[PDB]
């Protein structure tokens, strides 16, 4: 619908040194927030954000029975210690634990994997790392909006399910519903913070991405949406 | 000299693809604020905001008699139709009128310059392309001492330069300032420096921006005043 660029948000990106882009929607006034009306709207790899839909996929098809179905560890060590033992859906999408969601996807299969991105309209195996799929900001909203209101056309359980263990942050002011990335396989490389903010009257979506040289910089993605929520008196 | 960096003013300069600082001072509070507090204490040739202090010194010595004097165009046509007539100190001031400084200058002498920039603590055609630097904050030091009519001259000599200073006056606001524009050497700037009266306080200000180009002269008052409007100093 309506978009609006405030290049003052710029200035949460320079102060940290950094280059990216956060898109706001409010949900109330259907209007749109972008620094970057541009940026906004490039397609990237969606990494670990792909595992909004992989979860849903996996839970309609009954490849997930639910979110305490447990996947037991293969035994091979990684060098994220957090994948090291078994999980669920609730860890699996905390922790990011990739060997988790591409099990997923080989039960899933290509042909169903394929069906599901078209029917949920999803941007354009390891596809989601190094692979063709590809998302803007804008499209990662468009998305989320879909599964805030039961819409995209899975179960509506699926879509409860993924919405719990989308779970980041909830106190009195506000509930964060959301997934972090980081796409390095392929240039550039950036950091993703995708979800929204729930607040008592109103919804924000949220889609920030940014240049990720390093792994130093992984906080930015917080830290630089959580400054833009402030500005806009979104959260205290 | 209390110092507080408030990052927040960089939104002013990145909504407009602009880098630079502003620099507030409190009066009544003797505290001051910067979006920069290192661009803040960096030195740039004063360009036209050395008509402040050059119109100081000219008065003081009786090079100029008063701001009703008239200094004759010398009948040269220059880029800037405004140069091209007769001024005094006020209009001088108001139109930036260089050739009417340089003139001022000349009959100052190097000597006396010297000893009154010395005696005025001011920063270290020398202020368009020689060895003369200001900083926003020691901008702000020698502003404080105009207002204060606390620099060595003539009380007479200063009210008259705070007078020409005149920008700007309504009913919630005056404006005494002098705007810069620095291009015979890197890098490019614009200046904005001087106050802002109100009823009951004075906020000295010192702003200078990366300018590239003409193009954005405007941005000088327009940053400026979007800081004023978001510190409630003005509507
Ligand atoms: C999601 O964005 C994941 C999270 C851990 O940052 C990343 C992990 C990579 S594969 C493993 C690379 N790092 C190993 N130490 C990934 C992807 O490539 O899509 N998602
Ligand atoms: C002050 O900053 C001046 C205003 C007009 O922008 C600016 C003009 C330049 S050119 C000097 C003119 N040369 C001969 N008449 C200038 C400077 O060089 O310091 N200041
Ligand atoms: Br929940
Ligand atoms: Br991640
Ligand atoms: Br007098
Ligand atoms: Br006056
Ligand atoms: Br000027």
């Known amino acids: 619908k ?46 670990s954000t792909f595992k909004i839909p992989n979860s849903l996929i996996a839970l309609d098809l009954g490849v997930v029975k639910d979110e305490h179905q447990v996947f037991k560890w293969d035994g091979q060590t990684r060098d994220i210690a957090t994948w090291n033992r078994d999980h669920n859906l609730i860890t699996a999408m905390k922790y990011s634990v990739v060997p988790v969601y591409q099990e997923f996807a ?12 078209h029917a949920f309209d999803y941007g ?20 989320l909006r879909k599964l805030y209101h039961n819409k995209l056309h899975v179960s509506e359980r699926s879509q409860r399910i993924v919405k719990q263990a989308m779970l980041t942050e909830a106190n009195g002011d506000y509930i964060i519903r959301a ?14 913070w995708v979800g929204w903010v729930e607040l008592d009257d109103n919804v924000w ?16 993605r917080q830290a630089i949406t959580k400054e833009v929520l402030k500005q806009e008196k979104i959260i205290p």
């Open 106 to 117: 080989r039960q899933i299969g290509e042909a169903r994997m394929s069906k599901m991105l």
């Open 179 to 192: 997934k972090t990335g980081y796409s390095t396989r392929i240039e550039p490389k950036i950091g993703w």
């Open 2 to 47: 309506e978009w609006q660029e405030n290049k003052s948000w710029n200035a949460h990106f320079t102060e940290h040194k950094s280059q990216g882009v956060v898109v706001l929607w409010n949900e109330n006034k259907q209007q749109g927030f972008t620094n970057n009306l541009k940026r906004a709207n490039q397609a990237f790899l969606p990494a």
């Open 124 to 143: 354009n195996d390891s596809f989601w790392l190094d692979g063709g799929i590809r998302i803007s900001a804008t499209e990662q909203i468009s998305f």
């Open 205 to 220: 979506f949220f889609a920030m991405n940014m240049d990720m040289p390093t792994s130093d910089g992984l906080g930015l």
